Amino acid sequence: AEPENFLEIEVHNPKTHIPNGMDSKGMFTDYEIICRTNLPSFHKRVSKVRRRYSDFEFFRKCLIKEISMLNHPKVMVPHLPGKILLSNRFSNEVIEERRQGLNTWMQSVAGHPLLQSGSKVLVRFIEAEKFV
């Protein structure tokens, strides 16, 4: 075991799911989050999950609420990038911009010492097959 705590995380592998049937789920895109860590708050070393941009939005709301409960009225969570949309949500432009933005955002959030030690939502967002 590594003597020091560590958390590696990346958001990549964006995928737009094309419907094949007239009754299949509506077209949508999600991103893969890959994380490796030895933090005591986590339950396994490697986690690989997929998340829609809306999952990140829900996560931010949940995280901000948990932080206030953890009594950290000064900790601030950055804006989620790529919220505004003036281009087709399924264009490579938008998806790549979201991928890059989400990657940077996730490393910033998951990299915060206080969230690493006391945030339960952070762990669930990274580990659960389905966030909800």
Residues 6+ apart with CB under 8 A from 106: 9, 10, 11, 33
Contact 93, 101 (CB under 8 A): no
Amino acid at 115: L
Cα pseudo-dihedral 81, 129, 93, 101, rounded to 10: 30
Solved how? Answer: X-ray
CA distances (Å), 10 to each of 5, 31, 73, 87, 88, in order? 17, 10, 28, 25, 24
Please indicate if the annotation marks 36 as binding a ligand.
no
Please indicate if the annotation marks 52 as binding a ligand.
yes
The CATH code of the domain at 1-132 is: 3.30.1520.10
- CA 116 to centroid of chain Cα atoms: 14
Instruction: Report the distance separating Cα 94 and Cα 17, nearest Å.
Output: 15
Q: b or e along 78-112 (b: 16 or more beta carbons within 10 Å of the residue's beta carbon)?
A: eebbbeeeeeeeeeeebbeebbebbbebbeebbeb
Strand partners, 29: 16
Please indicate if the annotation marks 119 as binding a ligand.
no
Give this entry's resolution in angstroms: 2.0
Identify which of 10, 44, 63, 24 has the alpha carbon closest to the alpha carbon of residue 129. 44
Please indicate if the annotation marks 124 as binding a ligand.
no
* DSSP assigned state of 44: -
